Every structure is written in C-alpha cells, then in structure tokens.
C-alpha cells in the first residue's frame, strides 16, 4: 500500500452513501501508523477531506480523524513524546489536527442533519475523555452547539 492507495482509498469514500466504512478507516489508520515519517501529508489530506467532502459525509470525515487521531494519541502515551514541534511525529500530527478542529467541528455540526449532529456529540464526549484535543477547544464547540 502506498500513498496513492491512501488517496484512492480516501477518494473512494465519495461513492459511499453514508460516508462511513470501518474497513477503509482501518486501512487508513494502519497506513497512518506505518507512515508517520510522512504524517504531515496524511494529516492535511484528512484535514482537507473534512473541509471538502459532501454534507452527509462530514461525520465520517470526523470518524477518520478520530481513528487516526486516537491511534497517534495512543503512541505518544506509550512512547512519552511531545514533539509538538517536530515534523514526522505523532505529537506534531495531533497538534496539527488541533489547530483546525474547531473550524472543522463548526462546519460539520452545521451541515449535518439531526441524526449526524447527535453522533458528533458522541464524538465530542470521547475526545473530551481521551484527551485527544484541548478541552477548551471542545468546550467552545459544546457551548455553542450542544447545550
């Protein structure tokens, strides 16, 4: 599997009515765990995909972020690194996703229907409990959309 299959895999979420496929998210995530040396490229791709995908797909874009984000997060706690400043590191990738997560969340909650708006709330809970993103960022989101 090479980066073109990551792009192709990610491009194929567009033919899925739901925008959700656990097998393919598991492919992306396994790939993300094998190619941290190019995490910056993986990250802006999954960041940009959430900005550009259709409206009913925005939850699955945030599922892909949750899947890669929480596996990278499980590495920094097994490896005790906070290289938030070093490219090619799991610490950097989460730092990158965090700087844009609010803009992604405001847009994803905005363009979802009530069903998907609910599942985004479930996502805010896990991230709040996992420590994936700064709690202050999620609170700004929860205080304006889920309350």
């Amino acid at each position: 599997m090479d980066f073109q299959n990551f792009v192709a895999t990610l491009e194929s979420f567009k033919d899925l009515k739901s925008g959700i496929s656990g097998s393919r998210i598991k492919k992306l995530t396994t790939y993300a765990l094998d190619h941290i040396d190019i995490e910056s490229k993986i990250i802006s791709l999954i960041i940009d995909y959430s900005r550009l995908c259709p409206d009913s797909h925005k939850l699955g874009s945030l599922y892909i972020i949750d899947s890669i984000g929480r596996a990278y997060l499980d590495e920094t706690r097994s490896n005790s690194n906070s290289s938030s400043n070093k490219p090619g590191t799991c610490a950097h990738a989460i730092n990158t996703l965090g700087e844009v997560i609010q803009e992604l969340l405001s847009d994803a909650i905005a363009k979802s229907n009530q069903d998907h708006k609910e599942k985004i709330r479930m996502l805010l809970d896990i991230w709040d409990r996992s420590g994936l993103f700064q709690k202050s960022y999620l609170n700004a989101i929860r205080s304006k959309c889920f309350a």
Binding site: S18, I20, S21, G22, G60, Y63, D66, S67, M122
Partner: peptide, 7 residues
C-alpha cells in the same frame, strides 16, 4: 453497512 466502531 460497514460501520465505524466508536472505540
């Protein structure tokens, strides 16, 4: 439906 497991 191949869904995403929230875990």
């Amino acid at each position: 439906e191949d869904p995403y497991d929230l875990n």
